[PDB]
């Protein structure tokens, strides 16, 4: 009976209370750890974590908290070595927090488009 960080998080926030702070901070901590090792099968867990959080956030939480950490993460992995995480997260057809992708169309064209442009 394996355990999933995304599943435990979704439940912890859908039980009665969570505030969306401890479960989030912890989630990001787990992700960081997964990146600590530095393996291929370890990056799969990270993406699965960003996919579970991104949805829970964009849906109705802290969409800006994602594009915030995203802006830093992108520039961080770029000026480090884990630049593959971007080539991966992008290749997966995934994009930043889009206005329409949320409930209220609130996001600049520089956030969703500038982050993922067709031509270089």
Curated annotation (Swiss-Prot):
Subcellular location: Nucleus; Nucleus, Nucleolus; Chromosome
PTM sites of type N6-acetyllysine: 71, 76
Post-translational modification summary for this protein: ADP-ribosylated by PARP3. Phosphorylated on serine residues. Phosphorylation by PRKDC may enhance helicase activity.
Induction: In osteoblasts, by FGF2.
Covalent cross-link (Glycyl lysine isopeptide (Lys-Gly) (interchain with G-Cter in SUMO2)), residues: 80, 99
Signal peptide: none
Note: Individuals with systemic lupus erythematosus (SLE) and related disorders produce extremely large amounts of autoantibodies to XRCC6 and XRCC5.
Subunit composition and interactions: Heterodimer composed of XRCC5/Ku80 and XRCC6/Ku70; heterodimerization stabilizes XRCC5 protein. Component of the core long-range non-homologous end joining (NHEJ) complex (also named DNA-PK complex) composed of PRKDC, LIG4, XRCC4, XRCC6/Ku70, XRCC5/Ku86 and NHEJ1/XLF. Additional component of the NHEJ complex includes PAXX. Following autophosphorylation, PRKDC dissociates from DNA, leading to formation of the short-range NHEJ complex, composed of LIG4, XRCC4, XRCC6/Ku70, XRCC5/Ku86 and NHEJ1/XLF. (Microbial infection) Interacts with human T-cell leukemia virus 1/HTLV-1 protein HBZ.
Protein family (similarity comment): Belongs to the ku80 family.
Function of the molecule: Single-stranded DNA-dependent ATP-dependent helicase that plays a key role in DNA non-homologous end joining (NHEJ) by recruiting DNA-PK to DNA. Required for double-strand break repair and V(D)J recombination. Also has a role in chromosome translocation. The DNA helicase II complex binds preferentially to fork-like ends of double-stranded DNA in a cell cycle-dependent manner. It works in the 3'-5' direction. During NHEJ, the XRCC5-XRRC6 dimer performs the recognition step: it recognizes and binds to the broken ends of the DNA and protects them from further resection.
Domain remarks: The EEXXXDDL motif is required for the interaction with catalytic subunit PRKDC and its recruitment to sites of DNA damage.
Protein name in UniProt: X-ray repair cross-complementing protein 5
Gene from which the chain derives: XRCC5
Part of the whole protein covered: 590 to 709 of 732
